[PDB]
Amino acid sequence: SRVRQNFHPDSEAAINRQINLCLYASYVYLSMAYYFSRDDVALNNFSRYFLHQSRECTEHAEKLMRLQNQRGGRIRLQDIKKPEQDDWESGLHAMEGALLLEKNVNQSLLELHALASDKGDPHLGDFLETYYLNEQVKSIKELGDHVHNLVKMGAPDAGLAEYLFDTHTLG
Amino acid sequence: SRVRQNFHPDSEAAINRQINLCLYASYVYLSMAYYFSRDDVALNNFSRYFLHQSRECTEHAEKLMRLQNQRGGRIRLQDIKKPEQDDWESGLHAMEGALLLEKNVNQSLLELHALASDKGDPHLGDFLETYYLNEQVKSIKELGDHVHNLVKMGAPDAGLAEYLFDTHTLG
Amino acid sequence: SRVRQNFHPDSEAAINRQINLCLYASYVYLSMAYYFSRDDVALNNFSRYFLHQSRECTEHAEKLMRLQNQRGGRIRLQDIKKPEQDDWESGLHAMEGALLLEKNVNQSLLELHALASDKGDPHLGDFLETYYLNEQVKSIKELGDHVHNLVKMGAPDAGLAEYLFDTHTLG
Amino acid sequence: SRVRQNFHPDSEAAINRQINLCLYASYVYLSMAYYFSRDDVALNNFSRYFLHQSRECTEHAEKLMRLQNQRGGRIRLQDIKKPEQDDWESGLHAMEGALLLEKNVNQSLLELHALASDKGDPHLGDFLETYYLNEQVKSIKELGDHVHNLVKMGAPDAGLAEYLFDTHTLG
Amino acid sequence: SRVRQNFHPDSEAAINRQINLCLYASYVYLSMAYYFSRDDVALNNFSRYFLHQSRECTEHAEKLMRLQNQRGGRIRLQDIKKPEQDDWESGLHAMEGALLLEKNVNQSLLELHALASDKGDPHLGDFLETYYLNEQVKSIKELGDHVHNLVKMGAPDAGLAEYLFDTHTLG
Amino acid sequence: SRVRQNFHPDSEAAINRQINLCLYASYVYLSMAYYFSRDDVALNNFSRYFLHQSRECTEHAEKLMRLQNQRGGRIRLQDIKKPEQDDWESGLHAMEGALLLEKNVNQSLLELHALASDKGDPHLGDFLETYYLNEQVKSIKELGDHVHNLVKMGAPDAGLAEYLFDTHTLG
Ligand SMILES: [Au+]
Ligand SMILES: [Au+]
Ligand SMILES: [Au+]
Ligand SMILES: [Au+]
Ligand SMILES: [Au+]
Ligand SMILES: [Au+]
């Protein structure tokens, strides 16, 4: 590739893996989003919250696809695995699931950064620092805030908890 | 009638029946609307919600009266029966009553569509598809959402449930 | 009822009767409105005139339902009887029918006022004076004007009469 | 054709026939339009009314030509037959002629819909439902309204009838 | 489910299958979009064209997820399979691949419509007619137009063909 | 006819012939317009060019119908013959066909002018001079320009010719 420079085959491959992971997270959030628009759940702001989290994840994945092409790597897509559940059980359980998901995504991004460092690729390191690492920290912190409030409010069993959290925090 | 074409007498008669039904549903919703403005109920947004549902139903009935005339049928009105109750008991009970009502109205519209198909009347079939069938599905879904939230919140016996649902969801 | 004061059970019952009557008049006018949009009648401004008269009557009925609740009475709905005819025969015959209808409605409102006086209920008396009695007089006078012009013009048998009245007076 | 899918040769041929019919109706209305701008007829609003009906029909025909190409069919034009008359005799006779024309066009469209159903072509069925069937019903109803008023007014022999109908209804 | 009415388990299952298919098509188009932003392809308007086609497909899939919930069905996601190729070879080959893809998607939607008809579900039939069937026909027609022009221009081997098509048609 | 003056029966008849011819040319151009929106032709600006030429021709025909009525002649319509071909083969062949068509139309208009002169009808002569003769010359000149460029560019066999002419000249 006539543009390739300082771009290690392991980095290119790790980027392809992160693209699949970030697409998977997008898919998890889409599943969650339409769980909360079920007639027997009907928490519309939970629904909009996770839909927005889905788009953020799709944008993360496209930016990595764009990075692959900018550096002369070659995008290789894999299946996007279905989420672990279709029934996300409650607003609290979904938020806790999102938190676990974002920490796994964050672990992968951190390992991708360590690889970039090992290979002496400061462009890739800065790319992750500038667009991913702090977004992940903000996302994880926000999900932690929500989990805490939902637990403190008595979710899932206190009938008013998820309803009121839906209308006040997520509205 | 010099405009009548492909318009079966059974369809004309079924349309007259649907007009009475859609007027009845309008009357049920009007009853519900003024139940919630009682001084011993005083849920003003429940009141406005059902009043709006009443108007939607009056518009449905007028559109069917208009269809009758467009096709050369002849409108034949019948008594509009009083609702089953004047005292609708609670916000939850009214919402559940509306849901049952809308499903019966939906069943009638679906049977009217099947008649139109049997008689080869695609204008009538499309009329129902375009203005009634999806409106009924949206309406029924919304009432299901509300019923679910009210139950989850502990209505009717939890004193805060209908009050908070009134101010947050229906406001 | 913790709001009830100076509100006689006969007044409450008479109000429920007037609600049914005012809803009936609304139904009569709706029937008339869609008679004039028949392809073999097709007097669109007669149609709009009676449709407007129908809404005025629905608003009268809702205001009485509202009054019932303001005073602590309890709304009790009855069947809304179908109009005496589906075929209103001509613009003149419909106008004459409306005039008779409004005079009967006016008689009922006047009897309701006399009851309010007998029971010493000046709030109810003023309510009727402020929102019903003069509206009825304006309505009856207008219908008399129209009946007179239609007769003078030679309706129903002079072919130009209802057509020209439709376009000039009711447009 | 690399776009053709689920598109039956009988439907393609029936569409070509409907294109000719809808072009013919356009031609009939053009003939009528310039009959009423004759110095010995001079009903300018009849003229504009039928000219507008002509354009609606040209747009119907072009939409069917467009549908043919969208589905991969092949447009085959035939002669556009001259109207049955150049002298349309009166405003009433022209309106009655338009009504008969629109009912024949409507019959053809309904038969085209039944063919689409038989061939399992829901795209074609919906196309007719969405753009033709209800337009035809509105058109036929309107022509019925006009015919009725013109007859009631005493057209064609009452000298004021077509003149006044021209200025009031069609202006 | 308290909202479910006239909704057959086979329709619910077929809808889940169509959701996976429409998500797959979205994934195919995303793959194509980032193939054309490769430094050794660099047809930016091909890239934007297929990216737009990807979003249209994501919106189709979300609307079906929404329909599932409106009708009381239950969304069940499956893996989204990777596209058949990462290297789409040329602008012509990608357009031909999109055409084949859209015809397969169209076949599935048509089979879904036939199922809805068999089960007497006119809401589902109309949903497909209103939002999918004609969009598919427009899409397939457009891809056919593009394939034709690219072939006529001498793509893929004429060096100016895809470049000029990119700048003129897709810009 | 009380308006007829200096209007020769041969002129009236020749005008009726020109109306049919100008309607025919309109029909030829409509055929051409929808040939270029075929999926295996797909030259959208050729399509819009000939559609515009079709409307110009319809306006020419209506103006002659209007002239007939202004002068007291009587419009007599004949069948509009189908075009010689449905398949117009190429952009060049269609342009050459339009050129031949416009020259025949021009010959007819010139012969109509010579008739007007012979009959001493300067109103008819000026009508043709003012609205037809120079429009025909502009039209024929433009078609000649296009034919020349298309030939010089190597149409129909050079794949880029009609495509580039479509986007640059006709856009
Ligand atoms: Au991500
Ligand atoms: Au209704
Ligand atoms: Au009243
Ligand atoms: Au037509
Ligand atoms: Au799709
Ligand atoms: Au012409």
Author numbering:
A (entry chain A), B (entry chain A), C (entry chain A), D (entry chain A), E (entry chain A), F (entry chain A): 6 to 176
Reproduce passages from the article.
Ferritin ubiquitously occurs in animals, plants and bacteria, and plays a significant role in iron storage and detoxification. It is a nearly spherical 24-subunits-protein with exterior diameter about 12 nm and a hollow cavity of 8 nm. Like human H-chain ferritin, the ferroxidase centers of HuFtMt are composed of A and B iron binding sites of conserved amino acid ligands His65, Glu27, Glu107, Glu61 and Glu62. Herein, we take the compartmentalization concept to re-design the intrasubunit interface of ferritin to create a new compartment for fabrication of fluorescent Au NCs, while keeping the inherent protein cavity functional.
Therefore, to create specific Au ions binding site at the ferroxidase center, we re-designed these centers by genetically introducing cysteine residues as potential coordination ligands into them under help of the YASARA software in two steps. Differently, the crystal structure of 2Cys-ΔC shows that one gold atom is coordinated by Cys27 and Cys62 in a linear geometry, occupying the original A site of the ferroxidase site, and this Au ion was buried within four α-helix bundle of each subunit. There are totally 24 Au ions occurring at each protein shell as shown in Fig. 2A3. Thus, these crystal structures validated our re-design of the ferroxidase center in atomic detail, thereby supporting the utility of the intrasubunit interface strategy for creating the specific Au binding sites. In contrast, the 2Cys-ΔC-templated Au NCs emit a weak fluorescence under the same experimental condition, which has an UV–vis absorbance at 390 nm, which is the characteristic surface plasmon resonance peak of small metal NCs.
